Amino acid sequence: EKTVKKIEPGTAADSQQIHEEKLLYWNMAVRDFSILINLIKVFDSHPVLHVCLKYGRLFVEAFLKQCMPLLDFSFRKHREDVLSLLETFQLDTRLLHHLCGHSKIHQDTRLTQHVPLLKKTLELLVCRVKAMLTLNNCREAFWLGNLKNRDLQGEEIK
């Protein structure tokens, strides 16, 4: 969280030579965030997922605040890589929502403490993606779907 937070967003006037390694670092960061998050299942203990909730909401909030201006500036130049890292973060967001559902299903005050702000920032990232599409004169391209309620192991529940 500290490492991703400290990196500032380059401006649109900045050259693509300075944007490209930024996006590469962002792609690496989200990839290792994904492989870190996918290790929750092996240990379904209280404190590990408890810390995971708080630091996940912090990480996605930092990603929202910093990366999204860079995506707004550099969508046209690096569209395919932007979609690739957005798809990877979509996988990560699906994992986060599944963790949220697992926390909500298991009645637990400590786990449920960090849920609503997490969902707020996650949904606000979704609406920020919509805003990013709108800023690039492609609001019609945006679309939504309902995500299935899969538990930690990856199986649908009623």
Place this chain on the structure above:
Amino acid sequence: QYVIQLTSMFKDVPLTAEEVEFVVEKALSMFSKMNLQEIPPLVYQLLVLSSKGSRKSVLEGIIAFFSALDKQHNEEQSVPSGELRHVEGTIILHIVFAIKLDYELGRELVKHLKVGQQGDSNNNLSPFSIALLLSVTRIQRFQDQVLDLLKTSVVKSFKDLQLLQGSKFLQNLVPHRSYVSTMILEVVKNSVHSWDHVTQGLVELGFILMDSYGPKKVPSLSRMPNQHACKLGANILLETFKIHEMIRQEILEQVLNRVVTRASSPISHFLDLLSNIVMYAPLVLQSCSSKVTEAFDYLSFLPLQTVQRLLKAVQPLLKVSMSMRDCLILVLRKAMFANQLDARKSAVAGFLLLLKNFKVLGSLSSSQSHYNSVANETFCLEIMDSLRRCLSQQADVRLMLYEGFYDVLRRNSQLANSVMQTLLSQLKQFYEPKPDLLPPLKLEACILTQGDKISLQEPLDYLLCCIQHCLAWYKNTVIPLQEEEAFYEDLDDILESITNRMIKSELEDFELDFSQSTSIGIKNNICAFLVMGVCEVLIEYNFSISSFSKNRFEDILSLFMCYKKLSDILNEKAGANKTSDSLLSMKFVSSLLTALFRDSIQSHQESLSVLRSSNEFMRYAVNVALQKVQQLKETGHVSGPDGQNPEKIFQNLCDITRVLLWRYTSIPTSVEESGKKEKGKSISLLCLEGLQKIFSAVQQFYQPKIQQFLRALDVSVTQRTAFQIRQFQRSLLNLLSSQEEDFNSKEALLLVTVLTSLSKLLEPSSPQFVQMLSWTSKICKENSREDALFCKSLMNLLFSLHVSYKSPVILLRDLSQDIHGHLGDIDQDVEVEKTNHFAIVNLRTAAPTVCLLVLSQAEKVLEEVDWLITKLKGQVSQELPNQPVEKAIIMQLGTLLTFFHELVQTALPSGSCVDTLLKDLCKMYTTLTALVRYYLQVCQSSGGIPKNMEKLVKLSGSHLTPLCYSFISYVQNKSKATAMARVLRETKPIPNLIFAIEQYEKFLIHLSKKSKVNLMQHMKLSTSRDFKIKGNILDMVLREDG
């Protein structure tokens, strides 16, 4: 009692476990039985024994006992004795010395009595507690803290009263025992009984409250929290000044210390306080001669409005101190040549006010008087010589001078013999003597020709205005009351010549037929204003002297035709410039309207047939009446004479109201029969405009005399206003049953605005309110016209009536089905239509207009709900009548949830409406979270849960919870640097809704944990969305962009 004393002495040893029980049980035992005189010694014993420990345990007991004694006295007086207060004065002093001895006691006391939330007070305050707080305010450490506490308590209580008066649902539910405003007034009344330490607290609280929330922009969010609260401060500054003699010499200095100093922001409330204290007891102003003396030196550097009321206030001082009068006139005459415009205007207003107040004992006409009559006379005459110096100055000074000479003449008659001559000199500065000469005005001398700019010097229209009013006053009063008389008829001859030459005049003389582009156009426009003003003042004069002669009214018609073509030429030039407050006097306007419409005498009718033959004058009379009432809207004063008198202007205004109402009532629109150019400008529409404006102004200004107002317009005021609302209702029914293709939308919305304005006068419980409610319901259910504004006004009227009648929630539910039927659905697989609920709803007006109004009313009832549940949490913190209140809350939420469930499927237009819907959804779910939060505190103590909220939770989960997610998905699915602001603005509410919903999920999970009922089984899992990008659209848009 000796047993109590010896046990108290024996208990001086340090003990905690048994000592607290002994002192509290003995305390309540002596509170329940002992004599009044033996309480203070027992008070000393218990407070000194409680110093060892358990201070608050005895503090709450004693303060509650004295509160109970206060309530006992209140119900007894509503045995009584003065000494009941006096013993409290002996008691309170000692305990505050304990507060002086023990600071932690005061710390815990002010900490407990802190209003943590709006209901945490729960009337914990009391007259004795307020007296204790003010005594603590005497001590310096907790002075600012307790003052802020009292200020916040007053603000919260005023907000609570505003909400209580804003809806009858709380009145039915909650008692009306909430009041701290009258608490301080009762404390002030009780301070007569030798409570002198309290007075410092009263003055400090009053001053901090007064200067905190005063107006600064010169506030619907804090209308009563701020403005009325300032009045409460002002009220106590009056009340203590009426009661406590010693403090009278103090507070005035502080007032002066503000009044001279804070010259930037408005100080009007302090001015009104100063006027009311000096009016009540001006003798105290003799004491502070030095303070007013040093204040007078600053008169060149004050606002004029401060100067008017200050110099009006200091007049009783001027009646005695002749040396101070000489000093005052010295600083005024020294202030004449100051280059600051405000200083000059201030000095001249002071001149006119002081010469107005000094009465010349010889032959002055009555009232509305120093023994040295000749001294007064020579003083007034030298002041008039100073005014002769004054008059040759810039335009604003002259305007104020001529405005004030009428009041000077009214309150002082002898000086008129000079004033008119002075005015005649000014008249002789511009009125040519030869009748052969065409103009009575020289444009060069009239206007200040100067280098690189043009400005007014001396308004000749105002000269003629003042001359006419003074001459009419003298002819009406002094000559009937009764060497140098000749100039009077000479003035008439002068005006007669100024009449004649003017009717024979033309635009060629004044070089007309011009704007701010060039100085030539500027002077021409100023001359146009001047000739218009003097022409209408000549209309005033000729109408005054004629006594209905045919030739005189022919002159009036020609003169007014000249004025009309001048006005038309100015309007064509414009097509700021048009707006000119005409000089027609209020009395003359009323008399002209009454003569125009209500006329029976044949000799009058002979001239009035010629006068009324031109409809332009008929429009002009009502138009100047409109302008006068609109001027009255912003301030009590008016342009014409008698601006200061409220009684005279109101009594005269009643006449124009009844005359104009008769005009509209007895004349239908068919009588007009005018062309379409002036049909919109028909005098009936102007009449309705005037009726709307005046019926909005009257109850705003003249609240106490409403009964006499309505009586003079044509028992209880409800039965009286039943008549007028019935005629207006019949007129509305006739208008709305007209041809469907088109209708007078302006007339309809003006009329329903008049209905809304007059409806607030009605007593809600009377049958007249029921009749109005039923007729409005019939109109809404039966009629459907294509006009957004008309439907909006009718909806606002209906809701404003209904909220007074009862809760609007049933009407919310019944309108919900209608809006859902008219608009549609987001699924496009379910068909809904129920149009019989309210025909006023329409597919052309349901979405943009009706939805905002109904959502705002929904937000209002949620505001009521969250205030009420906050008070429930407060009384929970305090400690079973709340069950019916809870049932009412649950029913209201259930029906409003049904309203939400009906509307949420609807495909509203994208824009502000969906944003308001999302915000109001957030408000609803936050109130639900507050409700379950309230349940968490009480059911955990009880260990069980009732069966109502379970039904509420299950119906909420079945109706609205997944439907919210579906509607959010629809909202995003419904497709279309400066734009960045809008894009970021429209990013928050959709996340905020799920944040509220999940907050509710978390809180009900906690409720299930702490109540052993799995309420989560009722609600389904939180459906969540994921975004997708259509690559084909990106390819197309990038290809065409490239």
Place this chain on the structure above:
Amino acid sequence: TKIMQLISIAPENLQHDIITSLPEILGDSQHADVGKELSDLLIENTSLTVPILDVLSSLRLDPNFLLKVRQLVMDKLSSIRLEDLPVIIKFILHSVTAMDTLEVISELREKLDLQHCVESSGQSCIILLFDVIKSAIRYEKTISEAWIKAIENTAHKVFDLVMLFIIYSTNTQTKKYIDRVLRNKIRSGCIQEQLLQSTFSVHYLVLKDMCSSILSLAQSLLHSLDQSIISFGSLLYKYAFKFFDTYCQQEVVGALVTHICSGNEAEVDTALDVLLELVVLNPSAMMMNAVFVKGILDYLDNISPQQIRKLFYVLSTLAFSKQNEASSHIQDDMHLVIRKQLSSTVFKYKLIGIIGAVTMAGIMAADRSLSDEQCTQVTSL
């Protein structure tokens, strides 16, 4: 024509007299032409310039004509004596538009002659400058706010700091705003410490008229926990004590005793340190201050034992700094009250009494490298 003839022919005293009488003689009409002609005289002559500046301030002229004289006189503002200055700045402050405020404020603050100028006439002229500034600031709001905005843009002059003090004193509306601005300025470190000493050296007489306002300012700053602000407040308190007469020296200790009675640890520590260095600076003034130490001694309960460890230091020092009947009756009553406090068997009263008594005995007994009577007295107690 008559006035100009008298100006041309008459000597310096008579022409000066008619000039200073000009606003009363002239009516409204002759303002512009007479103004242009006296500006021509300003171009011609220099001796009578200051009275012409006075009447130009008094008389009614438009801003466009005032611009020329403003441009001519701003150059010479840097090269005029102290006796001339206050009426020139009176003209400048009362002959400015709404938009030109920041420019002229910055320019006049840069062109100040007090740095090189600073007899009794000089100090009288300085208070006349400050009275002119008080009159101008009190009502000309735009100039008032533009002063704070200009110095905030500037982000060190003593004259500016005294003007800042009186601005805090007079305008109640700028109270919290100027308090925050002063806190920001002292936090930034632009306000050095020596300029405080020089300010109190040069403008001690002027500062007395608002010393109550500076006491309120320092009292407000005491609540702030920043070390720089605390040092600033202590410096202001000690300078105000050491420069002003017995009056302000009484109200400062009257405020400090209440600050000690507040009981907050930072406030009580700073107040005790200020009192100790105050007694070190000048015990003679503190000798008259007798009721304040009694009030300090009365509220033994609020003051913590750590603070009591050094609280007795100050009172014992000022008591035994110089032998006097003042010291005698300051010593006998405190000795009696601590003796009877020790006489009480309560452990708290015994603790406070013994902590006071040991420090008292040490302070009176200690000396640099003491008669037989003093030895007997200290041994006996």
Place this chain on the structure above:
DNA sequence: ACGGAACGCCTGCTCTGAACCTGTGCC
């Protein structure tokens, strides 16, 4: 061994009024 609760400070929410401009309706 661990967490929430309590309460002082702070950011950042919420309203508020005004200026500003396009869009509408009409001549």
Place this chain on the structure above:
DNA sequence: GGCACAGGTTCAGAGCAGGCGTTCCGT
């Protein structure tokens, strides 16, 4: 076809609450 009218949008500022921060106690 363009003016005058109006409501919308935008904004900067005023004012304040919860939630972080920290500590203590219950769990």
